Amino acid sequence: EKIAIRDFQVGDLVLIILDERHDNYVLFTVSPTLYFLHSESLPALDLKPGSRRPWVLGKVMEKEYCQAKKAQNRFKVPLGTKFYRVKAVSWN
């Protein structure tokens, strides 16, 4: 198995990393688009909400495309930003 870096599909192995700027876990990607880890997947990956672990390997599951409708939001992106929210489970 190899780590996907863009165009994420169900079942892809991915590297989930702590993004300091957004203080949220995101998928490691070469895409300009943000792929945020769904908050419900934190326990699935043994991660804590916000010392935090810098990365973990996971497997892509459900994915949703989103747009920020408010200027200040939980993803810490500007108003109008389009991004993904991805669920993931532990590898193996």
Quick structural overview:
It comes from Homo sapiens. The N and C termini lie close together (11 Å).
Quickly list its features.
structural protein, 92 residues, monomer, RB1-inducible coiled-coil protein 1, mainly beta, autophagy, FIP200, monomeric
Which helices and strands, and how do they pair?
Elements: E1 13-19, E2 24-27, E3 35-37, E4 55-67, E5 82-90
Parallel strand pairs: 3-5
Antiparallel strand pairs: 1-2, 1-4, 4-5
Q: How would you describe this structure to a colleague?
A:
The chain has 92 residues and is mostly beta strands. It has one domain (1-92). Helices cover 0% and strands 39% of the residues. It has strands at residues 13-19, 24-27, 35-37, 55-67, 82-90. The chain has a 5-stranded mixed beta sheet, with no helix packed on it. Strand 1 and strand 2 form a beta hairpin.
SSE order: EEEEE
Q: What's the arrangement of strands in the largest beta sheet?
A: 2-1-4-5-3
Number of domains: 1
Radius of gyration: 12 Å
| Structural class by sheet pairing and helices | mainly beta
Describe the global form. Answer: globular
State the total count of DSSP E strands. 5
Query: How far apart, in Å, are the first and last alpha carbons?
Result: 11 Å
Q: Could you estimate the helical fraction of the residues in percent?
A: under 10%
Largest β sheet strand count, sense and barrel closure: 5 strands, mixed
Note the beta-strand portion.
Answer: 35-45%
How many helical elements?
A: 0
Protein name: RB1-inducible coiled-coil protein 1
Family: Belongs to the ATG17 family.
Subcellular location: Nucleus; Cytoplasm; Cytoplasm, Cytosol; Preautophagosomal structure
PDB class: structural protein
